[PDB]
Design a protein around this ligand. Structure first.
Ligand SMILES: *[C@@H]1O[C@H](CO)[C@@H](O[C@@H]2O[C@H](CO)[C@@H](O[C@H]3O[C@H](CO)[C@@H](O)[C@H](O)[C@@H]3O)[C@H](O)[C@H]2NC(C)=O)[C@H](O)[C@H]1NC(C)=O
Ligand SMILES: *[C@@H]1O[C@H](CO)[C@@H](O[C@@H]2O[C@H](CO)[C@@H](O)[C@H](O)[C@H]2NC(C)=O)[C@H](O)[C@H]1NC(C)=O
Ligand SMILES: OC[C@H]1O[C@@](CO)(O[C@H]2O[C@H](CO)[C@@H](O)[C@H](O)[C@H]2O)[C@@H](O)[C@@H]1O
Length: 537
């Protein structure tokens, strides 16, 4: 019998109970601050949600503090929902969040540290005038929330967006202010989309072209593009475009309005929601946090006493081609690497399974690169309108193709009765052009009942002819984060195999295709636990 086999060893999560949306992340005076929607009374959502608070010097090891923002005014008497942090000139962290007032209205409130000499910013004070912003004209009281981090225009005016919808039409309501206290709604929203429902936790920020670095939220220029991110219809979507502060106009590069279809981009194609980023000026990088929901049952959560994880902080930047974003675990995670097991120039015959020995299979960092043999043998399949998730669910690791499925078997039991398969497939259209599919087959991840074992998939934008297909996996008990092609395609999975209660997990490399594939390089590292120190009461 193993105690709490589903808790992670290096992912952020509270000592116990329910946690969802990441809030107000930021770097202040050398300290990384992290906040999050928290229910201090149960392992499920509840009537009283507050901001949990933790600090870190490296984004890996944390110190849990007492909740920072909780009901104290009429403006947030019923709950303190999502918000963002903006460090104003003069070095004051300003927090804008959505509060549920005494009349159950979603309103935007302001708060800031009450003791800037405290490196951990434990105590916060609320602005006497809260709420600072209330639902506009024709917007429902429960469809106006999640203010973003603000950006200061060259005209000295601050901007922020607040999510919501007007008649089921997603909205990124734009507000302006010079003193950060008196805000005025701009005539038109920054962006929007028909019939998408409320836009949750919108994020708007710039990314430097031809650079793998991040930018302060207030930078603008021709060598900069902006990202409009919004959560709706159950997923986080984003679109790259150009921002004209003068006209408060956001023009999507592909000219499309978000539709929540295979036409739009996502940060992650698995369990990933309410993602929020912040700029780290110490390392000139933009860091992204995201809530990773549970996929087990509510009864399971109540029984184990907790629910919700945060994805591991990832650096974020725009690809050299300028058409999509790239994500990668922040370098500080590399410090958790212990012993290493490596493989090179290893052939994987059709229908073969190769076990990787010597690694702590439940807590590891695994990278593998495949060198393909005979691309022309790729199954012919035009994927212009194909839904990659549907395809992955239809063709799991047991569905044998020509090129694919080949990849990893993670959180697998000795006998393989339970396994999580992260793999690729290679296809070609009629004109000989290749496409690459990345799948997270969770269909056999557990023999347990009442577990959402839906699989996830996405197409990887690489040319198999000149690029080996690479895959990195962050394995941490009940969560697996997969990065294909250096972060071009990310998929986060939650799995709950039964075997982990009394036996060790295993790790395998496999190839169930009819074509041979070669492992050119494979690096696996056992990952030690991140430190979580409690400093409360
Ligand atoms: C690689 O592809 C194999 C061929 O599809 C796949 O086979 C597994 O074993 C047999 C076929 O050899 C099949 O299992 C069937 O029988 C069991 C009874 O124990 C049923 O419960 C299953 O539903 C199924 O009818 C399957 O095709 C497959 N087994 C399972 C669990 O589906 C291998 O498993 C594939 N290898 C990898 C690593 O995925
Ligand atoms: C504001 O923050 C400072 C810095 O943490 C607090 O000062 C510490 O207070 C504890 C308990 O009183 C002492 O043991 C430490 O030695 C103090 N350190 C410093 C830097 O002076 C201070 O108490 C906080 N102010 C309030 C009102 O709580
Ligand atoms: O915890 C509140 C936080 O949750 C989000 C997650 O997307 O929205 C959920 O909670 C709201 C308040 O109860 C609901 O109105 C909303 O429908 C639900 O999805 C965030 O939007 C919000 O800040």
């Amino acid at each position: 019998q193993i105690e709490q086999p589903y808790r992670t060893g290096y992912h952020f999560q509270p000592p116990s109970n329910w946690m969802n949306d990441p809030n107000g992340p930021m770097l202040y005076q050398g300290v990384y601050h992290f906040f999050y929607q928290y229910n201090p009374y149960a392992a499920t959502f509840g009537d009283v949600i507050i901001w949990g608070h933790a600090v870190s010097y490296d984004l890996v090891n944390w110190i849990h503090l007492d909740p920072a923002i909780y009901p104290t005014q009429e403006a947030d008497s019923k709950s303190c929902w999502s918000g963002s942090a903006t460090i104003l000139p003069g070095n004051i962290p300003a927090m804008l969040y959505t509060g549920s007032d005494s009349k159950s209205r979603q309103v935007q409130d302001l708060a800031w540290p009450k003791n800037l000499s405290d490196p951990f910013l434990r105590e916060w004070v609320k602005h006497p005038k809260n709420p600072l912003i209330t639902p506009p004209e024709g917007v429902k009281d429960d469809c106006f929330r999640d203010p973003s981090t603000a950006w200061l225009g060259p005209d000295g005016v601050w901007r922020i967006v607040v999510g919501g919808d007007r008649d089921n039409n997603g909205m990124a309501f734009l507000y302006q202010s010079t003193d950060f206290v008196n805000w005025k709604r701009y005539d038109q929203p920054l962006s929007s989309a028909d019939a998408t429902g409320t836009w949750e936790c919108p994020d708007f920020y710039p990314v430097p072209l031809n650079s793998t670095n991040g930018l302060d939220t207030s930078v603008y220029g021709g060598s900069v593009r902006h990202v409009m991110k919004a959560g709706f219809e159950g997923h986080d979507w984003y679109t790259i475009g150009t921002y004209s502060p003068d006209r408060e106009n956001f023009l999507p590069q592909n000219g499309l309005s978000l539709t929540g279809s295979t036409l739009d981009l996502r940060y992650d194609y698995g369990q990933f929601y309410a993602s929020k980023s912040f700029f780290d000026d110490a390392k000139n990088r933009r860091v992204l946090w995201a809530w990773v929901p549970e996929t087990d049952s509510q009864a399971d959560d109540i029984e184990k006493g907790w629910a919700g994880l945060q994805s591991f902080p990832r650096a974020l930047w725009i690809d050299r081609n300028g058409k999509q974003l790239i994500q990668w675990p922040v370098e500080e995670i590399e410090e958790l690497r212990q012993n290493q097991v490596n493989l090179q120039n290893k052939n994987l015959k059709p229908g073969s399974v190769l076990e990787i020995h010597g690694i702590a299979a439940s807590q590891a960092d695994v990278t593998i690169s495949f060198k393909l043999e005979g691309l022309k043998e790729a199954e012919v399949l035009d994927t212009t309108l194909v839904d990659p998730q549907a395809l992955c669910n239809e063709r799991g690791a047991s569905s044998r193709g020509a090129l694919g499925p080949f990849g990893l078997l993670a959180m697998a039991s000795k006998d393989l009765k339970e396994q999580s398969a992260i793999f690729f497939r290679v296809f070609q259209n009629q004109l000989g052009r290749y496409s690459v599919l990345m799948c997270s087959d969770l269909s056999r991840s557990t023999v347990r009942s009442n577990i959402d074992t839906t699989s996830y998939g996405a197409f990887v934008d690489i040319d198999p002819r000149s690029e080996e297909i690479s895959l990195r996996n962050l394995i941490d008990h009940s969560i697996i984060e997969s990065f294909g092609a250096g972060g071009k395609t990310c998929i986060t999975s939650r799995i709950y195999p039964k075997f982990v209660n009394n036996e060790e997990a295993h790790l395998f490399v496999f190839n169930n295709g009819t074509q041979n594939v070669k492992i050119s390089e494979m690096s696996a590292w056992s990952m030690k636990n991140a430190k979580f120190v409690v400093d409360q009461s």
